[PDB]
Structure formats: C-alpha cells, structure tokens
C-alpha cells in the first residue's frame, strides 16, 4: 500500500478524559476508561501499526527499521536514524504538571553526568541526551501556562500575596531576573509552616481577587491543594488557545497543560524537569540551572502561521519536525514532502489518493506516507494536519 492507515495506541493514564476522544471522534470506550493520549508514531513503548499486503499488521517502528531510507528519506535517515517525532492527541481531564525542557547541550551534559552513577529511579533527570522541542495545537479551547510574565505583570499579581513569603517581598523590592529565580526556587522549596502560611495567604487572596489568573489558580487547586505550584499562574503566562491556535514550547521555560484537547508534536526524548503540580521529587538546583528567567510578552506566545494556497504552515525553529494544516475541497491538492509524513483528519472527511489507491480518513484517523511515496493528493472537506520534516 502506498499510503498506510494507522492503527494507533491510546494511553489510559489516570488523568485522561473518559469522554473527549469519544465525543470528538467516535472512538469507543465501553469500559469508560480515562483516555489520556492517542499516539501517532513509532515509539518503542507503543508504536503505531500498519497493515500489510498479506493482512498482517506490523509495527511501524519495525517497518521503518527495515527500510529507513525509503520510509524516512535520506535526510531524516542520516540525521536522526529514526522517525524523529511523536505526534499525539492529548485529552487532559485535569491539570498536568509544570515542566521544563533542558536544551540540547545540557541534555547531553546531564545525560553523561548521571550515567556516571540508576535508570528508572526518581532522581534520574536525563533518561536520554536529546532535547525536547514541542508544539501544541488546540483542538478545543485549551488552557495552558507558558513562560514568565513581564516583570511589571508579576509585580502587580504578587502584591495581593506579598505577605505569603519573604521571597515575594524580596522580589517586589527589586523585580529582576535574579530575584525572580530566587522566588521560583523558594516557592518550590517551601516546607511545613512556611508552606502552609504561603498557601493560606494565597487561598484567601482568591476570595478578594476576581478573574484571571486567580480563576486559573482556583481550577488548579481542585486537584493540587497542597502544591507550591499554585503560585505559578502569578509568575507564568496563562493562555487560552482557541481551536486552531498553536504555541511552540521553547527550551528552558516553564509550561503546563491545564485543560482541554490538543494535538502535540514533539521530538523524541523522555527527559522532563518538573516544576510543580506534581507529587514527585523535584531537583530544584537542576531545575534552576535549566531555566531562562527572561520575561516573554503575551503577544509573542502563539505561533504565527503562514498561509499559502490550501496550506497553513506553523514555522518551528527546530529541525526535528514541522507542522502544517491543509484545507480540503472538491478539487485535489498535492501534499508532498521530502520526509515521512503523518496525516491526521482534524474535521470533515479526507480522501487521499495516490495513483489508483484511495484511502478515506474520518475525523481522528491518521495515515502514514513514506518518503518514497510523496506526494499524495487530497480532497474532501475540513482539514488535515500534517507532521513531517522540512530538511
């Protein structure tokens, strides 16, 4: 088959929505399980599968291993040696942890620092030496946090909780990167009476303070009542993405997914440094060494796409992946790339054609197109999301 309909894995993590994938796409869930992530790719823990001329399904990862140049293209093959991204539908029924991704050089350093002394333990920050760029694209209204607010923005939000902790008063007297870093670390490091004081003062402020981000803190607090993370909407931008909007998650920058359904594209790494809204241990010094305490203004948070014909590209400052949306109509458009691609039906209904082969995708279904099989022609109605490499 020139085009391969994907059989995909759904991770049933405890935080997933019991309904989102069913409401959006008709995906069955009779056991009423939490369906947290739908994986499109070649991850070894749970690769997508494809069907052979034969009738057998095979791992997409194994099929790529067997024919890398043909499937990935020479460029991706020689640079990555594998499908360099994982593509997901994320369906957060509750807020998730704050995270930070180290950049490439520090991932390499950290990965070698740690090898020299316990793989799947919980002081293991670097499970690998790859970086982890990500893009999120909203499928329903998507509440997230991303990056530090402008300092005057933080100063204004902290005033009502100045008495919460002395690190707050400290930042207020001189609101700079250094004191923001001390504040961030002190908040995460709070214990016992120090922490309960800080949390008591924050909970009370929620009665005197209306609107955002206070409202966001209320939402988080239903799931994380004793977490120092509750201060983070006062330091970090809270953003509500409308469906069709995207944000690229830069390295060294805190972020969190709080509510709603999105597509996510990432490079392949299981590194994560957590920075709150988690019960796990956090290595605060390592976290701090990997955060850029530089404000990001709200106007620069969303990725500005570029529209050319039926294609809306989302420019990504990283090589690991690219991402585009394709408006479908009756007349075919050619969708071609020098890499492997995964095409995913966001809404409507797509007919892919490659010569005589016709493959129909309904919303939520996806197909893999090997490098040797580009281009394919698309028609129908709605939109197709495409993940690929521009290299």
Shared domain for 256 and 373, answered yes or no, is no
What Rg do the C-alpha atoms of the chain give, in angstroms?
22
A 10 A CB-CB count for 31 gives: 7
Q: Which residues contact 86 (CB under 8 A, 6 or more apart)?
A: 39, 40, 41, 42, 43, 265, 266, 268
Nearest to 92 by CA among 45, 29, 147, 139: 139
Nearest to 107 by CA among 127, 82, 123, 135: 127
User: Does residue 74 sit in the same domain as residue 145?
Assistant: yes
Q: Who's near 300: CB < 8 A, 6+ residues apart?
A: none
CB neighbour class for 280 (10 Å; exposed up to 12, middle 13-18, buried from 19): exposed
The token duo for 123 is 């002081």
Q: Are residues 113 and 253 in the same domain?
A: yes
- Give me the phi and psi of 149, to 5 degrees please: -65, 160
Q: Quick one: 87 and 144 in the same domain? A: yes
Indicate which technique resolved this structure: X-ray
Catalytic site residues?
274
How far apart are the C-alpha atoms of 174 and 170, rounded to whole Å? 7
DSSP state of 279: S
Q: How far is CA 202 from CA 25, 55, 165, 215, 230, in A?
A: 40, 59, 10, 12, 8
Residue 314 phi, psi (nearest 5): -110, 90
Using alpha carbons, list the distances in angstroms from residue 53 to 56, 64, 70. 8, 16, 17
Question: Is 142 in the same domain as 289?
Answer: no
Do residues 359 and 326 share a domain? yes
> Residue 303 and residue 135: Cα distance in Å, rounded?
9
Question: Domain containing 68 — which CATH number?
Answer: 2.60.120.10
Contact 231, 187 (CB under 8 A): yes
Q: What is the CATH number of the domain that holds 233?
A: 1.10.441.10
Residues 119, 94: one domain? yes
Cβ atoms within 10 Å, residue 302: 17
Peptide bond into 150 cis (omega under 30): no
Among the residues of the chain, which ranges form H helices? 20-25, 60-66, 68-72, 74-79, 104-115, 151-158, 166-173, 177-189, 192-208, 214-221, 232-235, 284-289
Cα separation, 37 vs 26, whole angstroms: 15
Resolution in A: 2.1
- Domain of 122 in residue numbering reads as 7-149+238-275
d(Cα 253, Cα 296) in Å, to the nearest integer?
A: 10
266 and 296: one domain?
A: no
3-class state of residue 181 by DSSP: helix
DSSP 255: E
How far, in Å, CA of 108 to CA of 5, rounded? 36
Tokens of 113: 């620092």
Q: Are 249 and 133 in contact (CB under 8 A)?
A: yes
Same domain for 185 and 255? no
Return d(Cα 113, Cα 289) in angstroms, integer.
14
CB of 187 closer than 8 Å to CB of 165: yes
State the Cα–Cα distance between residues 353 and 82, nearest whole angstrom.
26
Tally of structural domains, the chain: 3
Please measure the distance between the N-terminal and C-terminal CA atoms of the chain and give it in whole angstroms: 25
Rounded CA separation 157/149 (Å): 10
CA–CA separation, 164 and 251 (whole Å): 30
Q: Which residue has the tokens 């004793």?
A: 226
Q: Output the CA torsion 334→340→344→345 (10° steps).
A: 20
Contacts for 62-67: CB closer than 8 Å, 24+ residues apart: 64/340, 67/370
* Same domain (yes/no): 126, 105: yes
In 10 A of CB 222, how many CB atoms? 9
Instruction: Indicate whether 246 and 318 sit together in one domain.
Output: no
CA distance 242 to 261: 11
Query: How many CB atoms sit inside 10 A of residue 164's CB?
Result: 23
C-alpha distance from residue 358 to each of 2, 113, 156 (Å): 10, 51, 58
Enter the tokens of residue 292. Answer: 């850029």
297 Cβ neighbours under 8 A, 6+ residues apart: 150
């Amino acid at each position: 088959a020139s085009m391969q309909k994907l059989i995909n894995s759904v991770q049933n993590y405890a935080w997933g929505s019991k309904t989102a994938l069913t409401e959006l796409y008709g995906i069955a869930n009779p056991q009423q399980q939490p369906m947290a992530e739908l994986w499109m790719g070649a991850h070894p823990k749970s690769s997508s599968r494809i069907t052979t001329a034969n009738g057998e399904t095979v791992s997409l990862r194994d099929a790529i291993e067997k024919n890398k140049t043909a499937m990935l293209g020479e460029a991706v093959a020689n640079r990555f040696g594998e499908l360099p991204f994982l593509f997901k539908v994320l369906c957060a029924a509750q807020p998730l942890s704050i995270q930070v991704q180290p950049n490439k050089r520090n991932s390499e350093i950290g990965f070698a620092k740690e090898n020299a002394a316990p793989m799947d333990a919980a002081e293991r920050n670097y499970k690998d030496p790859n970086h982890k760029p990500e893009l999120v694209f909203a499928l329903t209204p998507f509440l997230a946090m991303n990056a530090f607010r402008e300092f005057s923005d933080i100063v204004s939000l902290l005033q009502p909780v100045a008495g919460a902790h002395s690190a707050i008063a400290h930042f207020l007297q001189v609101p700079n990167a250094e004191r923001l870093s001390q504040l961030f670390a002190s908040l995460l490091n709070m214990q016992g009476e120090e922490k309960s004081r800080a949390l008591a003062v924050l909970k009370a402020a929620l009665n005197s303070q209306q609107g955002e981000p206070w409202q966001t803190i209320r939402v988080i607090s239903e799931y994380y009542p004793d977490d120092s993370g509750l201060f983070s909407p006062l330091l970090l931008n809270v953003v509500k993405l409308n469906p069709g909007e995207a944000m690229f998650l830069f390295a060294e920058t805190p972020h969190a997914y709080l509510q709603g359904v999105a597509l996510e594209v990432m490079a392949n790494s299981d590194n994560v440094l957590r920075a709150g809204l988690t019960p796990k241990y956090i290595d605060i010094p390592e976290l701090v060494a990997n955060v850029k305490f530089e404000p990001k203004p709200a106007g620069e948070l969303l990725t500005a796409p570029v529209k050319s014909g039926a294609e809306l590209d989302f420019p990504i400052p990283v090589d690991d992946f690219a991402f585009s949306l394709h408006d479908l109509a009756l007349q075919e458009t050619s969708i071609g790339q020098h890499s492997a691609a995964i095409l995913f039906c966001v809404e409507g209904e797509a007919v892919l054609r490659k010569d005589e082969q016709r493959l129909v995708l309904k919303p939520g279904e996806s197909a893999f197109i090997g490098a040797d099989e580009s281009p394919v022609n698309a028609s129908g109605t709605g939109r197709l999301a495409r993940v690929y490499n521009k290299l």
